[PDB]
Amino acid sequence: AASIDRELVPWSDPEFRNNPYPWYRRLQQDHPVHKLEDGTYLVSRYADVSHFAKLPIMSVEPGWADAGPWAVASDTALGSDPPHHTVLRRQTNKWFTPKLVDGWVRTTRELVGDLLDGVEAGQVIEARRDLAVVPTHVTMARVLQLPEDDADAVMEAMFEAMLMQSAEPADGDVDRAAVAFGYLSARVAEMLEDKRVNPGDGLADSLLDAARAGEITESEAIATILVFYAVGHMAIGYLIASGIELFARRPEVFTAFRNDESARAAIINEMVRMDPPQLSFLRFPTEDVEIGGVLIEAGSPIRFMIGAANRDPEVFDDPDVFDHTRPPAASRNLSFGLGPHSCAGQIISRAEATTVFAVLAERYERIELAEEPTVAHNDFARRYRKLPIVLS
Ligand code: HEM
């Protein structure tokens, strides 16, 4: 009964957390629309995720009903369906046009440079903190115009907060998320009181101006500021780390990234395809909908399996192999999601990854692992703890 669920997707199994893709291979071929004992439908075919996930009947709002500690993020873009979604989303889009982005990642460039300047031949660099988390965190903090010194505490807070996004939380996880979020709310409250008294001209000032003007509410401003401030480092952090590891295991790819500027975007997009940091998302249909022959009742949670779908053989040949010379079309992945809740940090993310890899490219020819990486993945979200590298 609930043992067919455990055969197919054992959410807590350590090996499944390390590498689910072999479970996904079977989920997608044999049970591409699967009803779970608790009532959640898993949709795992690409054509299916692509067509159905963006339909206007797919609401985000019930996902936030008993959010607990996550209630603090609910007055942001991901907690609203259109038409109110558009009003929020627009407030951050106008800060990440591609020209503005080129500006923001200068910060990322400086910082990776300052760090490599202080390294000696053969010195083991801990890539996760020093090339992924701090640079991206500080970059976003400077866009917002907020203090930039708390990367380490912001990351552990969000590590803890994310555990309750698992389909199978452990006893205690909701409680760890209360600790984390109450920490992030207090720090944001503190920085914003300092900002009310001494305004800047950053994205936080823009959202606060917007609330004083009535374009959004005070609460949407505060919450939108907190989400960006706290996730500035997070899934993009994972991506940069993942790319660094792949460069080390497949050095010809790093070489290709060094020597061919026009291949870079495609190299990054293949890294994104093959190792998405958020492995799924939930939507709740406002009316009955039929997918893959199964009728899904209005209100049922649907879980769209991004990771599963990025390996769909009816779209990508030899899906488990890294190949950056795929055509453009049979190289669209779902890692940044789709439809109106398509990632509001997609443009800056791609640029930050490009930039960090660029600075590495400019100075070194080889990346190597000093030890096996240390990971802390779950069934919803992937994570590195430590990625020790030697550059040469
Ligand atoms: C660079 C910092 C990032 C920020 C500030 C950011 C921010 C956000 C925000 C604000 C949303 C909700 C958008 C809306 O509902 O209108 C979102 C959605 C999402 N982001 Fe990001 N993101 C970042 C990096 C990434 C990266 C690198 C990935 C994936 C590789 C990613 C994956 C996603 C996914 C899958 C969604 C959609 C989830 C859903 O629809 O339920 N994010 N992001």
Which atom of ligand 1 is nearest the CA belonging to 228? 5
Which atom of ligand 1 is nearest the CA belonging to 334? 35
- Output the residue whose Cα is nearest ligand 1's atom 40: 341
The two tokens of residue 22 are 């072999």
Distance of CA 85 to the CA centre of its chain: 19
What's the CA-to-centroid distance between 342 and ligand 1, angstroms? 7
Selection from 34, 213, 239 nearest residue 247 by Cα: 239
Q: At what angle do helices 203-213 and 173-197 cross, to 10 degrees?
A: 80
Q: How far apart are CA 66 and CA 56, in angstroms?
A: 23
Which atom of ligand 1 is nearest the CA belonging to 80? 15
Mention every residue, 6+ apart, whose C-beta is less than 8 A from residue 148.
137, 138, 141, 142
Residue 196 marked as a ligand binder = no
Residue 343 marked as a ligand binder = yes
What's the CA-to-centroid distance between 68 and ligand 1, angstroms? 20
CB count in 10 Å sphere of residue 250: 13
- Residue for token digits 């090339």? 131
Residue 60 · residue 341 · CB < 8 Å: yes
Ligand 1 pocket test target in 52, 271, 343, 384 with most atoms within 8 Å of CB? 343
What's the CA-to-centroid distance between 89 and ligand 1, angstroms? 12
Q: How far apart are CA 388 and CA 370, in angstroms?
A: 5
Q: How far apart are CA 188 and CA 280, in angstroms?
A: 28
Which atom of ligand 1 is nearest the CA belonging to 239? 27
- In angstroms, the Cα distances linking 164 to 172, 178, 180, 306, 381 are 9, 10, 12, 19, 10
Selection from 159, 129, 157, 92 nearest residue 345 by Cα: 92
- Output the residue whose Cα is nearest ligand 1's atom 4: 345
CB count in 10 Å sphere of residue 241: 27
Q: How far apart are CA 64 and CA 62, in angstroms?
A: 5
Residue 132 marked as a ligand binder = no
What's the CA-to-centroid distance between 336 and ligand 1, angstroms? 6
What's the CA-to-centroid distance between 351 and ligand 1, angstroms? 15
What's the CA-to-centroid distance between 179 and ligand 1, angstroms? 23
**Resolution stated for this PDB structure, in Å:** 2.3
Amino acid 202 reads G
What dihedral do alpha carbons 339, 341, 344, 350 form, nearest 10°? Answer: -50
Residue 363 marked as a ligand binder = no
- Output the residue whose Cα is nearest ligand 1's atom 10: 344
DSSP 200: -
Distance of CA 225 to the CA centre of its chain: 17
Q: How far apart are CA 386 and CA 371, in angstroms?
A: 10
What's the CA-to-centroid distance between 231 and ligand 1, angstroms? 9
Give the number of domains in the chain: 1
Amino acid 369 reads L
Q: Could you tell me the CATH number of the domain that includes residue 16? A: 1.10.630.10
- Output the residue whose Cα is nearest ligand 1's atom 23: 345
- Residue for token digits 């055509």? 327
- The boundaries of the domain holding residue 352 are 1-392
Strands 388-391 and 41-43: unpaired
Phi, psi (deg, nearest 5) at residue 314: -80, -5
Task: Please list every protein residue whose CB sits less than 6 Å from any atom of ligand 1.
Answer: 77-78, 89, 227-228, 231-232, 235-236, 239, 272, 276-278, 281, 335-337, 341, 343-345, 348-349
